[PDB]
Ligand binder design. Structure first.
Ligand SMILES: *[C@@H]1O[C@H](CO)[C@@H](O[C@@H]2O[C@H](CO)[C@@H](O[C@@H]3O[C@H](CO[C@H]4O[C@H](CO[C@H]5O[C@H](CO)[C@@H](O)[C@H](O)[C@@H]5O)[C@@H](O)[C@H](O[C@H]5O[C@H](CO)[C@@H](O)[C@H](O)[C@@H]5O)[C@@H]4O)[C@@H](O)[C@H](O[C@H]4O[C@H](CO)[C@@H](O)[C@H](O)[C@@H]4O)[C@@H]3O)[C@H](O)[C@H]2NC(C)=O)[C@H](O)[C@H]1NC(C)=O
Ligand SMILES: *[C@@H]1O[C@H](CO)[C@@H](O[C@@H]2O[C@H](CO)[C@@H](O)[C@H](O[C@@H]3O[C@H](CO[C@H]4O[C@H](CO)[C@@H](O)[C@H](O)[C@@H]4O)[C@@H](O)[C@H](O)[C@@H]3O)[C@H]2NC(C)=O)[C@H](O)[C@H]1NC(C)=O
Ligand SMILES: *[C@@H]1O[C@H](CO)[C@@H](O[C@@H]2O[C@H](CO)[C@@H](O[C@@H]3O[C@H](CO[C@H]4O[C@H](CO)[C@@H](O)[C@H](O)[C@@H]4O)[C@@H](O)[C@H](O)[C@@H]3O)[C@H](O)[C@H]2NC(C)=O)[C@H](O)[C@H]1NC(C)=O
Ligand SMILES: *[C@@H]1O[C@H](CO)[C@@H](O[C@@H]2O[C@H](CO)[C@@H](O)[C@H](O)[C@H]2NC(C)=O)[C@H](O)[C@H]1NC(C)=O
Ligand SMILES: *[C@@H]1O[C@H](CO)[C@@H](O)[C@H](O)[C@H]1NC(C)=O
Lengths: 242, 213, 161
């Protein structure tokens, strides 16, 4: 019914990672479970696929059976990716070894039905019709570190007409993600929490800004709630005028 | 392997108009071609399999056509929800390969950015570093140029910027640029300015402050 | 007889996996679990077609006048003429097959009540595709049985509950 993948992973270069894809509402039986990866900005890349045989082949139909081997890997990953399934066929794993920084990517599992339809002596696929939510895999030499949170104080230099901008700078953390809310989720409108940027230091940095009526400065209290779960770091920063 | 070229790289379409995406394969892949929709921060979703056969629950405005090498995805009446990256994939010959994706953003009227500048905090200065943030708020289109000047010296290679995804109601973008200096360098200098160039501005806008004033 | 005489107009739109179970022998778990025999168009048929004179026999595609065709039933004029495997004497004849979207179809059957391969409410004729057409009979027990119709002796295997 639905594909649920394991949680985000952070790995040092040269290491290995093992990501799981679990079926809810049934079994992977008779499907190919594929793995597709997507480097942070880039397009999709097939890693390989593993077929979950419902049972022994009926060999009088061997010549038109569309399955060519239970396990297929893209050439780029041969020798360092292993795909397995448990005997229940409710979980398929992808283990990727000798990790490199270019292996940093979101890893999706996706179900493929190679027996979508048949006609005239051959059967055709339904493509990748059901996708897991993705498992982010970060490959970096950096060590886990909670952010420093600094105010982005409103000023005359951050007002236009009757509206002011203020924010929080969330600097020097590893790894992704952080969450930022404002006033414990009470203000969401007008908030821009920018995509983190990876600094040359290997640590990430992010700002979160919000626009508010200028007549609220020094009357309304503004707190950014920063949560960096990988380092167990939570910070509430009051942001007030210059 | 089979090479899939998607064109154009970016599409800007006004709501209610049609979007035509192209996907061209090196060798022939014979209707074994699929289209996926990837909305911001989400997993890819299947729209079309077998070049023209349409996945269930996919609205009728999505149509794929073609065979062999030249394929097209047509989005007839565009809704703002259709903001996404569209990927084509061939499964005619292993290994399966994907195009590089076509981003479809929502066309809207041009809007100049509101430009805000933030000096480093005193809390950060005592840590040894100064980050100066220039904020470009709610502009369209996404192309924008930020340039930093410190006492009129052009800064290059010591700033980084981030752009938000297009806003779902506004159809607008925002941009943050952070200039990073040491505390010592920060205090050797007076005028900090970011200069913003954008199609909605008659000429570049500069927002600046004088340190300690 | 030829592989190509199997009608192969198969369509698993809902991704149930029934079409995969044509190519592999798929056993079920507990959770998952008249009319006369004329001429059916191959377009409505997926996988092999069995008829039962008690004894099981396969029907291959032909044209409308009974000459064998070898186009996997893709031809609009391709049919399975079930009645041409009806033995000239004996009052027992049923058939079973899968329609295009994975629903088991039956044209009775035992003289009576039962339908197709079924001999009693308890028992049906065993044949190579029983578990595909009747997956919920996976843990039926297999008995060697013997039946007489029209004087002729039929030796077959029956699956019984
Ligand atoms: C989809 O299915 C259709 C079938 O419905 C199929 O069409 C057949 O195609 C094959 C191959 O191209 C044709 O085969 C040729 O047959 C030639 C003889 O044709 C005459 O005889 C046929 C059989 O007649 C017997 O059976 C009928 C029915 O019981 C009976 O009435 C007769 O008296 C006789 O007993 C007959 O069906 C056919 O009828 C068609 O044509 C007549 C006259 O044109 C027309 O009036 C009809 O209305 C009907 O359209 C005709 O009377 C045969 O000579 C020929 O052999 C040549 O080639 C081979 C190989 O090169 C050589 O060895 C040989 O020496 C000859 O050079 C060949 O075997 C067959 O006739 C078609 N059937 C029909 C009904 O058209 C399609 O191909 C299928 N399509 C796909 C996608 O696969
Ligand atoms: C393969 O074989 C299966 C099994 O027979 C075929 O599926 C059947 O196809 C026939 C012909 O189309 C349909 O009549 C059967 O489904 C339907 O019956 C419906 C009755 O449902 C009730 O509830 C609806 C709710 O919307 C009410 O509106 C109705 O009034 C009914 O009270 C009817 O609604 C549908 O319109 C339809 O007639 C259908 N049965 C099953 C199990 O699906 C299948 O089509 C065959 N496949 C092929 C391609 O040959
Ligand atoms: C039973 O069903 C099978 C599957 O449908 C049938 O196989 C089909 O047979 C037809 C015969 O007309 C083929 O159609 C032609 O295929 C040729 C292929 O030629 C290539 O290979 C040869 C041999 O090495 C080589 O010399 C050539 O240079 C080619 O590279 C094409 O050239 C023709 O254009 C035409 O497409 C089908 O391709 C074939 N399909 C499959 C999947 O095998 C078989 O004919 C049926 N048997 C009977 C008795 O009817
Ligand atoms: C498989 O079965 C499905 C459902 O029976 C068919 O779906 C139909 O597709 C056509 C053309 O795309 C539509 O015009 C119909 O409205 C669809 N029916 C519905 C209501 O789902 C499908 O064509 C069949 N064939 C294949 C090869 O998938
Ligand atoms: C049939 O018996 C088997 C084998 O012991 C059991 O595993 C299976 O679940 C049963 N199937 C059903 C329909 O319960």
């Amino acid at each position: 019914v639905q594909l649920e993948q394991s949680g985000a992973e952070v790995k040092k270069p040269g290491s290995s990672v093992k990501v799981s894809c679990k079926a809810s509402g049934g079994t992977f039986s008779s499907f190919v479970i594929n793995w597709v990866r997507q480097a942070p900005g880039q397009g999709l890349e097939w890693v390989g696929g593993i077929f979950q045989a419902p049972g022994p082949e009926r060999e009088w139909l061997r010549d038109i059976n569309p399955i060519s081997g239970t396990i297929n890997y893209a050439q780029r990953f041969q020798g360092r990716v292993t795909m397995t399934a448990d005997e229940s066929m409710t979980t398929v794993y992808m283990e990727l070894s000798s990790l490199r920084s270019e292996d940093t990517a979101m890893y999706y599992c996706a179900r493929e039905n190679k027996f979508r339809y048949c006609r005239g002596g051959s059967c055709y696929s339904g493509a990748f019709d059901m996708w897991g939510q993705g498992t982010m895999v970060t490959v970096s030499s950096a060590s886990t570190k909670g952010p420093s949170v600094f105010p982005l104080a409103p000023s005359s230099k951050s007002t236009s007409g009757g509206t002011a901008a203020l924010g929080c700078l969330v600097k020097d953390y590893f790894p992704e993600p952080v969450t930022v809310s404002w006033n414990s989720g009470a203000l969401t409108s007008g908030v821009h929490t920018f995509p983190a940027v990876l600094q040359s230091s290997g640590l990430y940095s992010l700002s979160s800004v919000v626009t508010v009526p200028s007549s609220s400065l020094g009357t309304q209290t503004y707190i950014c709630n920063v949560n960096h779960k990988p380092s167990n770091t939570k910070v509430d920063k009051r942001v007030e005028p210059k | 392997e089979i090479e899939l070229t998607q064109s154009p790289a970016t599409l800007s379409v006004s709501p209610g108009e049609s979007a035509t995406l192209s996907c061209r394969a090196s060798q022939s892949v014979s209707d074994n071609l699929a289209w996926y929709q990837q909305k911001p921060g989400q997993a890819p979703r299947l729209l079309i399999y077998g070049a023209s056969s349409r996945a269930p629950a996919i609205p009728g405005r999505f149509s794929g056509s073609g065979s062999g090498t030249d394929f097209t995805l047509t989005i007839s009446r565009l809704e703002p929800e259709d903001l996404a990256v569209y990927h084509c994939q061939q499964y005619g010959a292993s290994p399966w390969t994907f195009g590089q994706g076509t981003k479809v953003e929502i066309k809207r009227t041009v809007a100049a950015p509101s430009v805000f500048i933030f000096p480093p905090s005193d809390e950060q200065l005592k840590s040894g570093t100064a980050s100066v943030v220039c904020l470009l708020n709610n502009f369209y289109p996404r192309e924008a140029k930020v340039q930093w000047k410190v006492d009129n010296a052009l800064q290059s290679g010591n700033s980084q910027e981030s752009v938000t995804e297009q806003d779902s109601k506004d159809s607008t973008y925002s941009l943050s640029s952070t200039l990073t200096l040491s505390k010592a360098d920060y205090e050797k200098h007076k005028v900090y300015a970011c200069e913003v160039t954008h199609q909605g501005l008659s000429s570049p806008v500069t927002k600046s402050f004088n340190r300690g004033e | 007889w030829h592989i190509n005489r199997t009608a192969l107009n198969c369509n698993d739109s809902l991704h149930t996996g029934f079409l995969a179970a044509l190519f592999y022998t798929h056993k079920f778990n507990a959770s998952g679990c008249p009319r006369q025999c004329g001429t059916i168009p191959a377009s409505q048929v997926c996988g092999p077609v069995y008829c039962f004179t008690p004894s099981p026999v396969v029907v291959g595609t032909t044209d409308r006048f009974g000459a064998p065709t070898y186009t996997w039933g893709e031809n609009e004029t391709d049919v399975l003429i079930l009645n041409n495997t009806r033995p000239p004497q004996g009052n027992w004849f049923g058939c079973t097959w899968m329609n295009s979207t994975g629903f088991t179809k039956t044209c009775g059957g035992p003289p009576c009540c039962g339908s197709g391969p079924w001999l009693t409410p308890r028992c049906l004729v065993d044949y190579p595709y029983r578990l595909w057409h009747y997956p919920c009979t996976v843990n039926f027990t297999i008995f060697k049985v013997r039946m007489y119709v029209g004087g002729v002796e039929h030796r077959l295997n029956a699956a019984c509950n």
